[PDB]
Amino acid sequence: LQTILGGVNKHSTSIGKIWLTVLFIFRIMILVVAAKEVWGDEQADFVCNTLQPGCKNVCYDHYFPISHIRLWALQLIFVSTPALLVAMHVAYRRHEVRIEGSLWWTYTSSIFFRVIFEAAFMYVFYVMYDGFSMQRLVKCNAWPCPNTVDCFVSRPTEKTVFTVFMIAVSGICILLNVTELCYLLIRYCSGK
Amino acid sequence: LQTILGGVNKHSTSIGKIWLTVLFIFRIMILVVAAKEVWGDEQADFVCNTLQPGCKNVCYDHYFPISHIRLWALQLIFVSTPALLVAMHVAYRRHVRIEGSLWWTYTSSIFFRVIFEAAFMYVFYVMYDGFSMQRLVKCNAWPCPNTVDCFVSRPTEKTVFTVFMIAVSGICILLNVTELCYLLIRYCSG
Amino acid sequence: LQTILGGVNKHSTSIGKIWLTVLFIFRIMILVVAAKEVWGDEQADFVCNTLQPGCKNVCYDHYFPISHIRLWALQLIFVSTPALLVAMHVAYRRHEVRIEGSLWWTYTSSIFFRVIFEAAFMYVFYVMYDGFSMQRLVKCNAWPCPNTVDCFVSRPTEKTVFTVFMIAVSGICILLNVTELCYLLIRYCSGK
Amino acid sequence: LQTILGGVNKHSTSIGKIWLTVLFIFRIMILVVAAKEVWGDEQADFVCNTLQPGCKNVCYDHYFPISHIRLWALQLIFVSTPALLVAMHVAYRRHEKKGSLWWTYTSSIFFRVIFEAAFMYVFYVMYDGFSMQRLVKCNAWPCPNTVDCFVSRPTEKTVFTVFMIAVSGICILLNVTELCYLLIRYCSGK
Amino acid sequence: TSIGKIWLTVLFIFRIMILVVAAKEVWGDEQADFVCNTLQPGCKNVCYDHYFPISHIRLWALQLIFVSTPALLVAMHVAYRRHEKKRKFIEGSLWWTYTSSIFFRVIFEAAFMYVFYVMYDGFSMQRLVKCNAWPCPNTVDCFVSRPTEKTVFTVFMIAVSGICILLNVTELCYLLIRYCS
Amino acid sequence: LQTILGGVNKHSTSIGKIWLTVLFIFRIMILVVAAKEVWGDEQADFVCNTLQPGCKNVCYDHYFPISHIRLWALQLIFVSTPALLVAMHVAYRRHERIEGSLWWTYTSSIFFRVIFEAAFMYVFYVMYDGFSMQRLVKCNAWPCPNTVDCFVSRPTEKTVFTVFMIAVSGICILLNVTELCYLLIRYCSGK
Structure with a gap:
C-alpha cells in the first residue's frame, strides 16, 4: 500500500501531489473508516407502515436503486484508473516529473477523463436522489403496496452529512483538475 | 498480492497490460468492494407471501441455484488460472517475445480464456433468462401450495452490477480475440 | 504502520513527538480497540415506549444526527492532515528538526490549523450533545410520534466515560499545540 | 503466503508442481472465497415443520454430523501435512550434516493417496452420495412421529460438492501417476 | 531429536490449525441455539452456564498458551545467557532447564486433559441436558447445538494431546536414561 | 509487529524481559483470542423478568457501567505506554545497564506502571464488588417497577477470566516491585 501511494506520488506534478491527498485522506478513508457502517443497516432498519408482504x-428498491456507498466506491475506482493507467503505460514505454513528447497526450487525456468521470457521477447523484438531502419519510405506491405507504429511512441526517462531505470534496477535485488543464494549455499551446 | 501482480505484470505483452488492468481493477475490486455486500441478505430478505413452512x-433454491457472486468468483478463478499456469511452466523450463515452444503454450492459454469467459457468460444467460432481475418470482414447487408470490432483495442494484460485469467480460473477450489476430497474422501470414 | 509512524516522528521537534504519542496511542487506539464496539448497538438497542411505526x-435520528465515533473519526482525519501535508511538501522541496527559511511558514500554519480544528470539533461536540454526559432517557415529540414518547439509550454510562476521555485528551493536545506556538513566537516576534 | 508457496514450489518434480496449483488455486480458494459463506446459514435457515422444542x-445434528466445509478443511490439513513434514525433515537433515530422500518422498505420496481416498469415502458414506436433498424426514427423539425439515441452499451445495469431489479425484490420479513413475525407475528399473 | 522438533511442532501446528480454521465456527452458536423447553425467564x-462453565474452544486456547510458555521461557533463558556472555566478552545449566520444561509440558497437558474429563464427565457431548438450577421449575429439558460435530473435534484434540504426552514422555526418559548411564 | 516486540525486547534488563512475556502472551493474547468473544453477547443475552419497556x-447500564474487556483494554494501553515512551525518549537522544539521565526516566517508568496497575485493580474491586460475577442481579432503577430480576450471560466463564487477569496483574506488580528494589539497593548502598 505504501509502495502504491509512493509510486503514484513520485510521478505527479505540483498539484498532482495535492490531488492525491484529497483522494486518499478524504474520499477513501472517510468512505472506509467512517461511512461504510453508516449504511450497514440501510434496509434492515427501513420501516414501512403496512401489513402487506413484499411491500x-x-x-x-424504488427509492434506493443503488446505495450511496456503492455509488461512491464505483466513482473512486473509475477515477483512480486513469491515474494508474498512465503509470502502467509509462513503465511499458520506458522499458521499450516533467511533461514532454508522447507523454503529453497521455497525461492530458488522463486529466480530461477524470473531469468527465467526476462530473458524470456527481450528475448521477443529483438526478437519481433529487438533491443531496435525505428525507425521513418516503411515500411509496408501487405494487404490491396498497394505495400509498409511509416508509421511514434509517439515519437520514448522518447520511446527509456524509453526502455533503463527499460532494464538496468531489467538487474540489474538479477544480484542481481543470486548473491543471489551464497550466498545461498555457505552457504548451499558449507557450507557442 | 503486490508481488503476485508484479510477476504477472512484468511477463506480459502489449495488450496483456490492458487485459491485466481490466481483470484486477474491475472484475476483482467491484466483486470484493462493491458487489459482495449487495448479495449479503439475498436469502435473509427474500420474502414470500405464504404461511407454508419450508416454502x-x-x-x-429454485430461482437462485447458485448466487451471482459465487458464479463470478468461479469465473475469475478459472480465467486467472491459465495466466499463472504459463508462469509456472515457464519458470520450470528455465530450471516479452513469443517464440519456440512457449508459442504453443501462450496461444493455447489465451484460447482457454475465451472458452472459459464465453461459457460462464452463456451460463449466466441461460440460468437467469436474461441480465435483468425481477422484483416478483412466482413459485409452485412443493411444498408451496398452488403458486406463491415471493419478492427479491435489491433487484435494481443487482441488475446494475450484473450489467457491469457482463459488459466488462465482453470487453475481455474482444481483447483476447484480438490477440489471436496479432498472433495468426504473425504466423500464418508470415 | 511502523514506516508511517517512523516517517512522521523523524521529522518532528521535541514536543511534536510527545504530541504524536498522545494522538496515536490514545486517540486512535481507544477509538478502534475499545470505543468502536461500545457504539455498535447504538440503534439496535435504542428502545422507545410506543406502538407507532417509524417513531x-x-x-x-433527532438525538444522534451523527454518532460520537463518527465525529471522532472525522476529527482525527482533519487533525492529522496538516502534519502529513507538511511531510509531503517537505519532500517536494528537497527533490526540487530545525525550523528555518520558508519551512517556518508551513510549520507555523500547520500548528495553527490543528488548534482550530481541535477547538471546532470540541465545540460541535458540546453544542450538538448539550454537554458531555449521555442521558438514560430522551423525550421525543417529532412526527409521527404521538405527543411525547419515552426512549432509552443503550450503554449511556460507558459512552459518557469514553466521551470524557476523548475530550480530556483533545484538550491536552490543544495545550501542547499552543505551547509550541509560544516557543516559536518567542524566537521571532519576541526576538524583535 | 508467497513464501510458504514459494518454498514448496522450489522443491518439487514436474508433475508435483501441477499438483501444487490444483491444491491452492482450487481447493483452498473455492473453500475460502466461495464455499465457506454458502454454508454460513446452514443451521439458521434449517426449517422444520413442527412445534416441538428441541426437534x-x-x-x-442427525443429518449433518459434520459440515461439508469442516470436512473439506480437515482433508486439506491432512493432505498438506506430508508435504510439510518433508520440508521440515529436509531442513533438519541438512543441519545434521552441518536414498534417504527417496524413502520419505515416496511414503509422503502414498499417505496423500490414502488420505484423499479416505476422506472421499467418508463423504460418500456419511451423505449417501454427492447430491443434497431439499427435504429430510427425521424421527429422532423428541420429534413426534416423523417431521419434515428443509435444507438451506441444497442446489448450491450440490454444485460445490461435485466441484470438490472432481478436483480431489484429479489429485488422486496425479499422485498415482507420480507413484508409477518412481516405481518404474527403481523397482522395475533394476 | 526427530520426535523432539519435527513431530512435536507439527502436532502443535495441527492443534492450532484445527482450533482456528475449523473448530471456532462450530462453537460460534453455542448459546444462540441452546434451546430449553420452558417458559421461565432466565432459565x-x-x-x-451450569453445563458449560467455560467453552471447549476457550479451554483449548488456554491449553495451547500454557503449553507454549515452557519452550519460550527456555529460549529467553538460553538467548539471555549467550548474549550476556557475549557482551561481557566485548551444557550443564541448560540441561536442568530443558528437562524441567519438558516436565512442565507433560504436567500442563495432563492437567488440562484431566480438567476436560471432570468438567464434562466424559469426551462425548450429549444432545439433552437436564437442568434443575434456580429459577428453573423442577427439571427442565435443554438441547445442545451441534453435539456430534463437537464430539468429533473433541476426540481429535484429545487424541493429539495424548500423543504429545507420549512424545514428551519418550524424550524425557531418553535423557534420564543417558543421565543415569 | 515484530519490530515493536523486538524493539522492547532488545532494550530491557534481565527481569524486564520476563515482564514483557507475561504481558503479551497472557494479558494481550488471552484478551484477544479468548476473552473478547466471551463478552460479545453481554447485553444481547442479558435477560430481565419484566414487561416494562426500557427497564x-x-x-x-447500572450493573455494568463499563465492560470488563473495555476496562482491561484501557489498562493495557496505560501500562504499555511508559515502556514505549522510554524507547521514543531514548531514540530521541540517540539520533540527536542503566545510568546517567536514563536512571530517572527508567525508575519513573517503573513507578508509573505500578501506580497504573494498582489503580485499575482497585477500580475492578470497587466497581464490581469482588471478582466473582453473579448469576442474578436485582434492579430497582427507574422505570423498572419495584425490584426486577435480571440474569447475566455466561457468569462463570467471565469469573474464570476475571480471576486470571487479576492474578497475572498481581504477578506484574511483584515483578515491577522487585525491579524497584534492584535499582534502589544500588543507590542505597552508595548512600
Missing part, C-alpha cells in the same frame, strides 16, 4: 422490499 | 427454502 | 427511526 | 436441534 | 441463561 | 436498558 417493504419493492419500496426500498 | 421459502425451496423457492429461493 | 423509533425519527427519534434516534 | 430442530436434533434433526439437524 | 436458559443459568442452565447453559 | 433492561437501565438495569444493564
Whole structure:
C-alpha cells in the first residue's frame, strides 16, 4: 500500500501531489473508516407502515436503486484508473516529473477523463436522489403496496452529512483538475 | 498480492497490460468492494407471501441455484488460472517475445480464456433468462401450495452490477480475440 | 504502520513527538480497540415506549444526527492532515528538526490549523450533545410520534466515560499545540 | 503466503508442481472465497415443520454430523501435512550434516493417496452420495412421529460438492501417476 | 531429536490449525441455539452456564498458551545467557532447564486433559441436558447445538494431546536414561 | 509487529524481559483470542423478568457501567505506554545497564506502571464488588417497577477470566516491585 501511494506520488506534478491527498485522506478513508457502517443497516432498519408482504422490499428498491456507498466506491475506482493507467503505460514505454513528447497526450487525456468521470457521477447523484438531502419519510405506491405507504429511512441526517462531505470534496477535485488543464494549455499551446 | 501482480505484470505483452488492468481493477475490486455486500441478505430478505413452512427454502433454491457472486468468483478463478499456469511452466523450463515452444503454450492459454469467459457468460444467460432481475418470482414447487408470490432483495442494484460485469467480460473477450489476430497474422501470414 | 509512524516522528521537534504519542496511542487506539464496539448497538438497542411505526427511526435520528465515533473519526482525519501535508511538501522541496527559511511558514500554519480544528470539533461536540454526559432517557415529540414518547439509550454510562476521555485528551493536545506556538513566537516576534 | 508457496514450489518434480496449483488455486480458494459463506446459514435457515422444542436441534445434528466445509478443511490439513513434514525433515537433515530422500518422498505420496481416498469415502458414506436433498424426514427423539425439515441452499451445495469431489479425484490420479513413475525407475528399473 | 522438533511442532501446528480454521465456527452458536423447553425467564441463561462453565474452544486456547510458555521461557533463558556472555566478552545449566520444561509440558497437558474429563464427565457431548438450577421449575429439558460435530473435534484434540504426552514422555526418559548411564 | 516486540525486547534488563512475556502472551493474547468473544453477547443475552419497556436498558447500564474487556483494554494501553515512551525518549537522544539521565526516566517508568496497575485493580474491586460475577442481579432503577430480576450471560466463564487477569496483574506488580528494589539497593548502598 505504501509502495502504491509512493509510486503514484513520485510521478505527479505540483498539484498532482495535492490531488492525491484529497483522494486518499478524504474520499477513501472517510468512505472506509467512517461511512461504510453508516449504511450497514440501510434496509434492515427501513420501516414501512403496512401489513402487506413484499411491500417493504419493492419500496426500498424504488427509492434506493443503488446505495450511496456503492455509488461512491464505483466513482473512486473509475477515477483512480486513469491515474494508474498512465503509470502502467509509462513503465511499458520506458522499458521499450516533467511533461514532454508522447507523454503529453497521455497525461492530458488522463486529466480530461477524470473531469468527465467526476462530473458524470456527481450528475448521477443529483438526478437519481433529487438533491443531496435525505428525507425521513418516503411515500411509496408501487405494487404490491396498497394505495400509498409511509416508509421511514434509517439515519437520514448522518447520511446527509456524509453526502455533503463527499460532494464538496468531489467538487474540489474538479477544480484542481481543470486548473491543471489551464497550466498545461498555457505552457504548451499558449507557450507557442 | 503486490508481488503476485508484479510477476504477472512484468511477463506480459502489449495488450496483456490492458487485459491485466481490466481483470484486477474491475472484475476483482467491484466483486470484493462493491458487489459482495449487495448479495449479503439475498436469502435473509427474500420474502414470500405464504404461511407454508419450508416454502421459502425451496423457492429461493429454485430461482437462485447458485448466487451471482459465487458464479463470478468461479469465473475469475478459472480465467486467472491459465495466466499463472504459463508462469509456472515457464519458470520450470528455465530450471516479452513469443517464440519456440512457449508459442504453443501462450496461444493455447489465451484460447482457454475465451472458452472459459464465453461459457460462464452463456451460463449466466441461460440460468437467469436474461441480465435483468425481477422484483416478483412466482413459485409452485412443493411444498408451496398452488403458486406463491415471493419478492427479491435489491433487484435494481443487482441488475446494475450484473450489467457491469457482463459488459466488462465482453470487453475481455474482444481483447483476447484480438490477440489471436496479432498472433495468426504473425504466423500464418508470415 | 511502523514506516508511517517512523516517517512522521523523524521529522518532528521535541514536543511534536510527545504530541504524536498522545494522538496515536490514545486517540486512535481507544477509538478502534475499545470505543468502536461500545457504539455498535447504538440503534439496535435504542428502545422507545410506543406502538407507532417509524417513531423509533425519527427519534434516534433527532438525538444522534451523527454518532460520537463518527465525529471522532472525522476529527482525527482533519487533525492529522496538516502534519502529513507538511511531510509531503517537505519532500517536494528537497527533490526540487530545525525550523528555518520558508519551512517556518508551513510549520507555523500547520500548528495553527490543528488548534482550530481541535477547538471546532470540541465545540460541535458540546453544542450538538448539550454537554458531555449521555442521558438514560430522551423525550421525543417529532412526527409521527404521538405527543411525547419515552426512549432509552443503550450503554449511556460507558459512552459518557469514553466521551470524557476523548475530550480530556483533545484538550491536552490543544495545550501542547499552543505551547509550541509560544516557543516559536518567542524566537521571532519576541526576538524583535 | 508467497513464501510458504514459494518454498514448496522450489522443491518439487514436474508433475508435483501441477499438483501444487490444483491444491491452492482450487481447493483452498473455492473453500475460502466461495464455499465457506454458502454454508454460513446452514443451521439458521434449517426449517422444520413442527412445534416441538428441541426437534430442530436434533434433526439437524442427525443429518449433518459434520459440515461439508469442516470436512473439506480437515482433508486439506491432512493432505498438506506430508508435504510439510518433508520440508521440515529436509531442513533438519541438512543441519545434521552441518536414498534417504527417496524413502520419505515416496511414503509422503502414498499417505496423500490414502488420505484423499479416505476422506472421499467418508463423504460418500456419511451423505449417501454427492447430491443434497431439499427435504429430510427425521424421527429422532423428541420429534413426534416423523417431521419434515428443509435444507438451506441444497442446489448450491450440490454444485460445490461435485466441484470438490472432481478436483480431489484429479489429485488422486496425479499422485498415482507420480507413484508409477518412481516405481518404474527403481523397482522395475533394476 | 526427530520426535523432539519435527513431530512435536507439527502436532502443535495441527492443534492450532484445527482450533482456528475449523473448530471456532462450530462453537460460534453455542448459546444462540441452546434451546430449553420452558417458559421461565432466565432459565436458559443459568442452565447453559451450569453445563458449560467455560467453552471447549476457550479451554483449548488456554491449553495451547500454557503449553507454549515452557519452550519460550527456555529460549529467553538460553538467548539471555549467550548474549550476556557475549557482551561481557566485548551444557550443564541448560540441561536442568530443558528437562524441567519438558516436565512442565507433560504436567500442563495432563492437567488440562484431566480438567476436560471432570468438567464434562466424559469426551462425548450429549444432545439433552437436564437442568434443575434456580429459577428453573423442577427439571427442565435443554438441547445442545451441534453435539456430534463437537464430539468429533473433541476426540481429535484429545487424541493429539495424548500423543504429545507420549512424545514428551519418550524424550524425557531418553535423557534420564543417558543421565543415569 | 515484530519490530515493536523486538524493539522492547532488545532494550530491557534481565527481569524486564520476563515482564514483557507475561504481558503479551497472557494479558494481550488471552484478551484477544479468548476473552473478547466471551463478552460479545453481554447485553444481547442479558435477560430481565419484566414487561416494562426500557427497564433492561437501565438495569444493564447500572450493573455494568463499563465492560470488563473495555476496562482491561484501557489498562493495557496505560501500562504499555511508559515502556514505549522510554524507547521514543531514548531514540530521541540517540539520533540527536542503566545510568546517567536514563536512571530517572527508567525508575519513573517503573513507578508509573505500578501506580497504573494498582489503580485499575482497585477500580475492578470497587466497581464490581469482588471478582466473582453473579448469576442474578436485582434492579430497582427507574422505570423498572419495584425490584426486577435480571440474569447475566455466561457468569462463570467471565469469573474464570476475571480471576486470571487479576492474578497475572498481581504477578506484574511483584515483578515491577522487585525491579524497584534492584535499582534502589544500588543507590542505597552508595548512600
